[PDB]
Amino acid sequence: SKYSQDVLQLLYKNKPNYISGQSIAESLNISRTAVKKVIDQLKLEGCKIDSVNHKGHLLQQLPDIWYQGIIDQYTKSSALFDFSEVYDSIDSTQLAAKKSLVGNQSSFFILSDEQTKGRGRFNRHWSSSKGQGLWMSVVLRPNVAFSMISKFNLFIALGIRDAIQHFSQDEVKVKWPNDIYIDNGKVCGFLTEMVANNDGIEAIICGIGINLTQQLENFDESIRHRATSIQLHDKNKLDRYQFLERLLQEIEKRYNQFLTLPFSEIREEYNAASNIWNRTLLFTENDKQFKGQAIDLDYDGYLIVRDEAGESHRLISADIDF
Amino acid sequence: SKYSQDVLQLLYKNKPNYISGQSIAESLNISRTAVKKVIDQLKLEGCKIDSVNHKGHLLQQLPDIWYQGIIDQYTKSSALFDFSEVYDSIDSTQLAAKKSLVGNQSSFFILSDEQTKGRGRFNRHWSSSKGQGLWMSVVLRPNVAFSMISKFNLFIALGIRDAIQHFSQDEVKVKWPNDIYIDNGKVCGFLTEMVANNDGIEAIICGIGINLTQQLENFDESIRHRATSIQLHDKNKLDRYQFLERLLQEIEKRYNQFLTLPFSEIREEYNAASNIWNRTLLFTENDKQFKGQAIDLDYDGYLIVRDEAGESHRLISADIDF
Numbered sequence: 001s002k003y004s005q006d007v008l009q010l011l012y013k014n015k016p017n018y019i020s021g022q023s024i025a026e027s028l029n030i031s032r033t034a035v036k037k038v039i040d041q042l043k044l045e046g047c048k049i050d051s052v053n054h055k056g057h058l059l060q061q062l063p064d065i066w067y068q069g070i071i072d073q074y075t076k077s078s079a080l081f082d083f084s085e086v087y088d089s090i091d092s093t094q095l096a097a098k099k100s101l102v103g104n105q106s107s108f109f110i111l112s113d114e115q116t117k118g119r120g121r122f123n124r125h126w127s128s129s130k131g132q133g134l135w136m137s138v139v140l141r142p143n144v145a146f147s148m149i150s151k152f153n154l155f156i157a158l159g160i161r162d163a164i165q166h167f168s169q170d171e172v173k174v175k176w177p178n179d180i181y182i183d184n185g186k187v188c189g190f191l192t193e194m195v196a197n198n199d200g201i202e203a204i205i206c207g208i209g210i211n212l213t214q215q216l217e218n219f220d221e222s223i224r225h226r227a228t229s230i231q232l233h234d235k236n237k238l239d240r241y242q243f244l245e246r247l248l249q250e251i252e253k254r255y256n257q258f259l260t261l262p263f264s265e266i267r268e269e270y271n272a273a274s275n276i277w278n279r280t281l282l283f284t285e286n287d288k289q290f291k292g293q294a295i296d297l298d299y300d301g302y303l304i305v306r307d308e309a310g311e312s313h314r315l316i317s318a319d320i321d322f
Numbered sequence: 323s324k325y326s327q328d329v330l331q332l333l334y335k336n337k338p339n340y341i342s343g344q345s346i347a348e349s350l351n352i353s354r355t356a357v358k359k360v361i362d363q364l365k366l367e368g369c370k371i372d373s374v375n376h377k378g379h380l381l382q383q384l385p386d387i388w389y390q391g392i393i394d395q396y397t398k399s400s401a402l403f404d405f406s407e408v409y410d411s412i413d414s415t416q417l418a419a420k421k422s423l424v425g426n427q428s429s430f431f432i433l434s435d436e437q438t439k440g441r442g443r444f445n446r447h448w449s450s451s452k453g454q455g456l457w458m459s460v461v462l463r464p465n466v467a468f469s470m471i472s473k474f475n476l477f478i479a480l481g482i483r484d485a486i487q488h489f490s491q492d493e494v495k496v497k498w499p500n501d502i503y504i505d506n507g508k509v510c511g512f513l514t515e516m517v518a519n520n521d522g523i524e525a526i527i528c529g530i531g532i533n534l535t536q537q538l539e540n541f542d543e544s545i546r547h548r549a550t551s552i553q554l555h556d557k558n559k560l561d562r563y564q565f566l567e568r569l570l571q572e573i574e575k576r577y578n579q580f581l582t583l584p585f586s587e588i589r590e591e592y593n594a595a596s597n598i599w600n601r602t603l604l605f606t607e608n609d610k611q612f613k614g615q616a617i618d619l620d621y622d623g624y625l626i627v628r629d630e631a632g633e634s635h636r637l638i639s640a641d642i643d644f
């Protein structure tokens with residue numbers, strides 16, 4: 001329905017109070033009975049809405065599905081992002097982003113409940129299942145030299161880890177340069193790309209997938225042991241909207257650090273969070289493949305690694321498996 | 323008309339011979355009189371087509387306007403580019419490119435007779451006048467590390483200079499890192515951008531403007547002395563299609579060098595072509611502005627410059643004025 005979102009927006013915008021059939025009806029300027037219709041549908045979609053006669057309606061709990069209207073109430077109150085785009089299903093949130101950012105300077109982000117052609121590093125396939133995870137791309141506009149990309153990744157990583165962690169009862173670590181783990185479960189992968197040119201950056205596009213509500217029964221055969229959702233590590237139900245809120249809060253925070261700090265200022269912190277140490281690693285380099293021990297992250301965000309032949313490298317990136 | 327292009331294509335594809343009303347009519351499968359209609363229109367648009375009874379039609383000369391159909395006969399015969407997009411008018415060939423390259427790996431390019439929101443380095447305004455210049459963006463897919471961008475620029479520059487030069491009676495020089503001059507006239511500016519990410523490059527987008535057919539009367543007040551079109555330096559009329567052909571030929575050539583050479587291998591050549599030496603230069607650096615002498619291009623494509631206080635810098639880029 002045309003007003004379903006406007007109605008939702010009034011409900012959320014109005015917690016923790018009830019609002020009347022009539023109140024709302026006046027605001028959108030439509031019959032009160034048109035409102036009953038909207039609400040019964042919303043309920044029927046799985047919204048917890050308390051309706052008491054004489055008092056009105058209280059939005060209690062939202063479904064594992066994304067609503068533009070309520071997300072708008074996020075971008076409004078935000079002083080990082082201009083706007084956002086919300087989708088039920090879509091080729092890729094990244095694709096969409098890389099399109100939507102041309103010929104403008106907006107900072108914004110994009111959510112989908114499901115991706116059909118969702119991809120990870122190296123045009124890998126990324127499973128984006130309906131209503132199970134956060135599948136989001138994030139466009140930012142930091143005016144810095146293109147080389148600075150790699151630094152961004154490092155900062156965001158902690159941002160992402162932190163948000164996830166606030167909801168996990170188990171240890172959320174980072175697996176440089178792009179993976180967030182909980183114990184042995186990839187809870188999240190994330191991809192930092194950019195459009196840029198010698199004279200600096202046109203935009204940063206951070207694609208983030210975070211597994212939210214999966215049960216091991218949900219993961220393909222090819223991965224079932226090294227994947228874990230936030231829910232397998234939270235005692236209570238994980239509210240996809242509650243989480244989103246903290247995650248932006250954190251993505252933001254971390255971004256300004258990115259913009260006003262060197263790497264060193266978070267370096268140690270980042271170290272204490274990595275789970276790549278003292279264990280053997282399987283690096284892969286188009287054609288080439290080999291092993292090695294991760295020995296340190298230098299001031300500059302490079303991984304220093306003693307390979308299996310005692311030979312010492314400095315990598316800005318890498319493709320690592322355990 | 324629906325078949326105007328298909329008809330053009332047959333004409334071009336058939337030089338230096340005539341083809342009949344009937345011949346063509348059979349090929350597209352439409353009445354011969356539908357053909358007369360097409361041709362008279364084409365003529366009326368300014369095509370030189372020789373029609374002799376009993377013999378048929380010979381395409382002699384094309385207008386200062388771009389035809390998809392004939393451009394297709396270029397991408398077909400090309401083993402660099404997959405396809406191309408041709409427009410009468412458009413926001414930007416670059417914008418268009420940055421859109422069209424998402425979610426695919428095509429190598430292709432885009433022409434417009436006129437840009438409305440045509441832009442140069444630094445979101446500068448770029449005058450793209452109807453039927454007067456080559457306004458083209460070029461998407462390539464060289465799998466290399468993102469750092470390699472700057473090297474591409476260097477190679478292309480010579481490519482561009484060469485093509486232009488084959489038609490100039492005057493000295494076509496380069497003004498690192500992005501401008502092609504003839505004497506004191508900017509004949510062409512060109513912008514190299516990319517979409518990429520730590521693990522290498524998603525695409526290279528080279529935006530190229532080249533002034534073709536302008537008379538000093540055509541240039542705004544704000545620039546009339548330091549701008550020149552290829553035509554002011556060619557004795558004969560400059561055939562925008564003849565030129566395009568050489569230019570791709572050259573853009574290609576130069577690109578493979580880019581992919582199979584170091585910079586040094588063309589370094590000296592590039593030097594002999596620059597016009598930045600032994601003259602004072604006005605560098606500009608957001609807020610800062612200062613002077614200096616260009617003293618050398620190092621093996622790595624960096625400009626070495628003695629500034630006005632004897633202080634020595636290595637720039638990968640710069641913003642320079644005379």
Ligand SMILES: O=C(O)CCCC[C@@H]1SC[C@@H]2NC(=O)N[C@@H]21
Pocket residue numbers: 091092093094095115117118119120121124126134135136137178179188189190191207208209210
């Ligand atoms: O490869 C990885 O390790 C992580 C990939 C990141 C996936 C995110 S989900 C949001 C998004 N949209 C995409 O098309 N890919 C991603």
Ligand SMILES: O=C(O)CCCC[C@@H]1SC[C@@H]2NC(=O)N[C@@H]21
Pocket residue numbers: 413414415416417437439440441442443446448456457458459500501510511512513529530531532
């Ligand atoms: O700023 C310069 O010195 C040169 C700019 C390059 C202009 C090319 S024309 C093709 C194209 N499309 C654009 O939007 N800009 C350019």
